[PDB]
Every structure is written in C-alpha cells, then in structure tokens.
Amino acid sequence: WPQRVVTKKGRTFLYPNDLLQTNPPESLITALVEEYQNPVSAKELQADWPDMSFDERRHVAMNL
Amino acid sequence: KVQLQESGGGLVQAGGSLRLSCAASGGTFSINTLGWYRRAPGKEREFVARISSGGITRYADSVKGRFTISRDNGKNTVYLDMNSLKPEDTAVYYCMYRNWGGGLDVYWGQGTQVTVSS
C-alpha cells in the first residue's frame, strides 16, 4: 500500500492511488493511442473516467 | 451475448409523462454506463441522457429538467422518466450499453416509438 501493479496485458499503475484520480492511469492512455491505434477512444476514456465507479475503474485498468 | 430489450413508450398528448425502461443481460451491468439516444423522424441519432456506473447523469440541453434517467442495479434496468413531453420529443428512442474492457464496444437496443401530438 501503494503497490505497483502489472496487469496481464503489461500495463503499470500504482494501486489504488492511480485509480483515485480524475484522469485514468497514464498507461491506459498510451495503450489506446499506440497499441490500439485509436486516439479518439483514449480521449473518450478521459471523459468517462471521472464519472466511473471504482469497481469499473479497476475492471477497465485490469483488462485494457 | 448482450441483450437490450426496451419496453414502455407509445402515444401521449403534450404535457404528458411517459416512462421508458431498458433491460440488459449477458454481461456485467453495475460496472457499465447506460443511456438513451433518440432519432427524430427526419433527423439522426441524438443524445438524450446518460448515467454512469457511478450514478452520474448527463442530459441534453433541450430535455434537461424535464427528463430524468435512473438505473436499477440488481434488476439490470435503466429507466428514463419523461415529463412535460412536447411534439419535438417524438422520436424512436434507443437504449445504450457502453462497456469498455476490451476497448470500448457500444451496444444499442432495437428501439421504442414515442409520439407526442396536439
């Protein structure tokens, strides 16, 4: 506490602190821009994040 | 593997109050954003209302204060309580299921007709 997390898909963020922010973990932004090659989804993730619940925030970070 | 069955809706007269409901199945719900889009007779899909997994409502300016969107976790249903309807609100109302996980898929319902006359 706080423990660095490595998700299956090889993303990194500091749990839980990186999920308690208005912005999503920077690892998820990069993944969506470069790997998924879809920058509009990354900017669309930024818009949903503040209104998301913690459970959804965790779920998204784990599987993205 | 994700079902969206909408119910309610019909024909009401101006000033009335209709209620739309949409039920989801086949995946998660509590950790999902649901909402409603409507397409007027000659127009294109238009945002009406959103509600996030955290329970945060977003409304379009035209329908704000009149329409109210709510969700029922544990029943896998989202409700849109329309009040003081107007002829311009006549449109096919579609359900929305906004799930991320894999990388943002968006699912729609088949639609429910809503017509306001007089």
Side-chain angles (χ1 to χ4, degrees):
Chain A
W1 233 16
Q3 43 264 337
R4 177 187 115 175
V5 166
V6 178
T7 125
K8 282 298 300 175
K9 284 251 238 169
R11 329 296 180 185
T12 309
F13 67 97
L14 190 51
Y15 185 98
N17 309 349
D18 278 15
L19 303 182
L20 311 184
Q21 308 291 335
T22 295
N23 314 88
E26 189 58 48
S27 311
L28 307 184
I29 300 297
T30 296
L32 290 192
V33 171
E34 296 173 4
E35 289 206 7
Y36 291 70
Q37 282 191 47
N38 197 347
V40 314
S41 57
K43 192 71 193 65
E44 216 184 349
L45 177 65
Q46 289 177 357
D48 298 339
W49 194 260
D51 295 8
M52 290 170 55
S53 62
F54 182 78
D55 294 315
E56 200 193 0
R57 279 182 186 184
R58 163 160 52 177
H59 172 272
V60 166
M62 293 299 186
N63 303 280
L64 197 77
Chain B
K1 195 181 69 55
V2 173
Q3 165 186 176
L4 292 183
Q5 278 204 329
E6 308 107 301
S7 59
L11 190 166
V12 71
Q13 190 181 348
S17 299
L18 242 181
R19 155 171 274 231
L20 293 171
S21 73
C22 168
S25 66
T28 63
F29 189 90
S30 45
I31 53 156
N32 288 264
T33 299
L34 293 97
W36 296 88
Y37 279 75
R38 79 185 180 184
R39 164 169 59 83
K43 307 296 181 311
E44 184 50 48
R45 221 115 84 163
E46 176 183 4
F47 172 83
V48 186
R50 175 204 295 257
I51 179 175
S52 69
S53 55
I56 301 300
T57 63
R58 304 183 188 171
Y59 296 95
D61 291 317
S62 55
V63 308
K64 213 147 191 171
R66 304 191 295 118
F67 294 1
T68 294
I69 182 172
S70 54
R71 75 191 294 151
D72 188 324
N73 297 348
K75 215 166 188 177
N76 294 22
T77 303
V78 53
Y79 302 108
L80 180 61
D81 288 330
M82 298 172 289
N83 290 326
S84 310
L85 288 103
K86 307 190 294 175
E88 306 80 49
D89 300 334
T90 294
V92 184
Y93 284 71
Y94 306 92
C95 185
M96 146 171 269
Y97 176 87
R98 179 153 166 170
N99 168 77
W100 278 94
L104 192 265
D105 320 277
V106 116
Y107 300 152
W108 305 102
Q110 275 297 317
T112 303
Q113 183 61 30
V114 168
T115 306
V116 185
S117 66
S118 184

